[PDB]
Amino acid sequence: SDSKILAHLFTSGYDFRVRPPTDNGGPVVVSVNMLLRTISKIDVVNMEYSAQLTLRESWIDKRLSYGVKGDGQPDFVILTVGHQIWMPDTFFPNEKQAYKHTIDKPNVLIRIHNDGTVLYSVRISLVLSCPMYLQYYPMDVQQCSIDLASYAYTTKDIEYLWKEHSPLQLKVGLSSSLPSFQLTNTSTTYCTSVTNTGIYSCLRTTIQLKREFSFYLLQLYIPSCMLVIVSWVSFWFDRTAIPARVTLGVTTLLTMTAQSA
């Protein structure tokens, strides 16, 4: 049944290198869903962060339709290995490092619906650059993003659109694997840009990170007040015993330096 349906699709003249055709000759519309699994290693020095996500792409390829109306055949067919399908050559413009997960078996999912609609899911671990602004350092908020666009296909061939309902989703155990920050807000936008090789469609998901204060309260502010207050207890020593006063003022001052370093 399923293996037969796959046979019927590739027994004909199908080329996985050819962009899927369109009714009005328009571009291929690729709907994108994104599931953030974990957001970790938020490096402030190299201004970047790590994040593992499940990318989900969906486009129509009338060449792969097998059931059309169906209603007698399976709604969709899981694409087995050895069958090539044109896929959006999407990449992450601000990715500095990336890994697909292929343990035991590649972590991918491809479905070919009867109407030709294709679902593509894959696990990806990224290390994206996130320019950070530390004007308010201790109590700051940063906005990090994941950009997603086609590399070779221009605006006439491929166009990205965020899924209509809940384009960005977060796994439940995300905020619990992110101890140092608090993911306050997320947004889903477009970043289509005009380059020297053409105009390329682009999506941009954005997360807002609020730095946890408890640490800086206990490791910076509290101990500094405690340090400044100690410098005051020398105002109560007789003016004759200056060795005691100096020892206090100097020590607290030196310590203040170390803490800052």
Epitope: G26, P27, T154, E159, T192, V194, T195, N196, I199
Partner: antibody, heavy 122, light 110 residues
Framework: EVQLQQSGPELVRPGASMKISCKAS????????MNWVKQSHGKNLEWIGL????????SYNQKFKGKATLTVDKSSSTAYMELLSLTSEDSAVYYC???????????????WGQGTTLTVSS | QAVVTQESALTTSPGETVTLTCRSS?????????ANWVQEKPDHLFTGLIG???NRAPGVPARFSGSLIGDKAALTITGAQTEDEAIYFC?????????FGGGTKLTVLG
């Protein structure tokens, strides 16, 4: 406030070629890409093409491929448009319309120019 | 090739709600057409209203709003004003270029 001031009206003979300008002020010029629209008495509004000031990159309407040449002078914050092999059909008002988004293509129009009336007659 | 169609003209009184429409000849106006709306006041004064995904130009009054009613792009002025009387051009994005419509001459009665 942003402004797009284009060159004055021009009269030129067929076969010749002239270049109209569009001096931008009131915004970071190199941030928003420029469109060029042609309004003729005979037809509707036509989209000629667009150029990214920061990039130098251009994209033309197939119709005006070779008829128009979009350039940009960053120093003077001016966008130029060459028109070649001018004919009777090129007699129109040419507007320059800025794109909306900051350092990215948004595909929507912000401000236009007052327009430049080009008359090609013999 | 592809042709954009608009109402030749429309009429409305100050305060009422009028709707202009933008029709695609190849089919339904979808989000990848990035329906744009442009206003032309007398003496060749052009300015953008709506466009892109659901972006609007700086300063565009709240009364102006875009939508995809039916299978064409809409431009709804809720609470029309006297100064709203102008010519409205809508443009659809087909693959790699813009196509404008014939424009609609909206008249606010006086």
């Amino acid at each position: 406030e942003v402004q797009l001031q284009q060159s004055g009206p021009e009269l030129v003979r067929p076969g010749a070629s002239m270049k109209i300008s569009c001096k931008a002020s009131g915004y970071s010029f190199t941030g928003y890409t420029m469109n060029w629209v042609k309004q003729s008495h005979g037809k509707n509004l036509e989209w000629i093409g667009l150029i990214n000031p920061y990039n130098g990159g251009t994209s033309y309407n197939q119709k005006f491929k070779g008829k128009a040449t979009l350039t940009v002078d960053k120093s003077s914050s001016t966008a130029y448009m060459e028109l070649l092999s001018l004919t009777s059909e090129d007699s129109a008002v040419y507007y320059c319309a800025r794109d909306g988004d900051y350092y990215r293509y948004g595909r929507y129009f912000d401000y236009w120019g007052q327009g430049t009336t080009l008359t090609v007659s013999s | 090739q592809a042709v954009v169609t608009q109402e030749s003209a429309l009429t409305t009184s100050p305060g009422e709600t009028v709707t202009l429409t933008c029709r695609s000849s190849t089919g339904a106006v979808t989000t990848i057409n990035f329906a744009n709306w442009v206003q032309e006041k007398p003496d060749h004064l052009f300015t953008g209203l709506i466009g892109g995904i659901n972006n609007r130009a700086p300063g565009v009054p709240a009364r102006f709003s875009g939508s995809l009613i039916g299978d064409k792009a809409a431009l709804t002025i809720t609470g029309a004003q006297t100064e709203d009387e102008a010519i409205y051009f809508c443009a659809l994005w087909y693959s790699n270029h813009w196509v404008f419509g014939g424009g609609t001459k909206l008249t606010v009665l006086g």
